[PDB]
Amino acid sequence: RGSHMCDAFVGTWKLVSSENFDDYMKEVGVGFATRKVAGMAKPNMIISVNGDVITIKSESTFKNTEISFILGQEFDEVTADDRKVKSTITLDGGVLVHVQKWDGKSTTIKRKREDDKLVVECVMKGVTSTRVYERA
């Protein structure tokens, strides 16, 4: 198989900045202790593409998580804060759009390339957090 547009996401990434993540976690419903420990974490994210399967791994002192998925096809995910969610990830004009549904709630995580960075925008209702990753 040849190159794909989403190969722009492939690589090893490290968190370099975070804004409003505590408030995002509060809106999601994360409890105090998990918010405190998760907010300290400086994760690395490892993204790879093999055929139609995209894999995103996160490694940190808080948790190590991994999802593999095909665009547009719903899957089960256990999040770092231990939510059991139903997730669907699509590509919208170069942006990976990840919707998680659980307990009648929903949150959207968008991942996009900007300059040499990978920007992750996490949205829960009116609350947005921006997390910026650079190449490791």
Ligand SMILES: O=C(O)c1ccccc1Nc1ccccc1
């Ligand atoms: O998703 C990860 O791997 C992750 C890694 C470090 C810190 C937080 C993380 N995610 C997260 C935590 C609470 C609510 C929503 C998402």
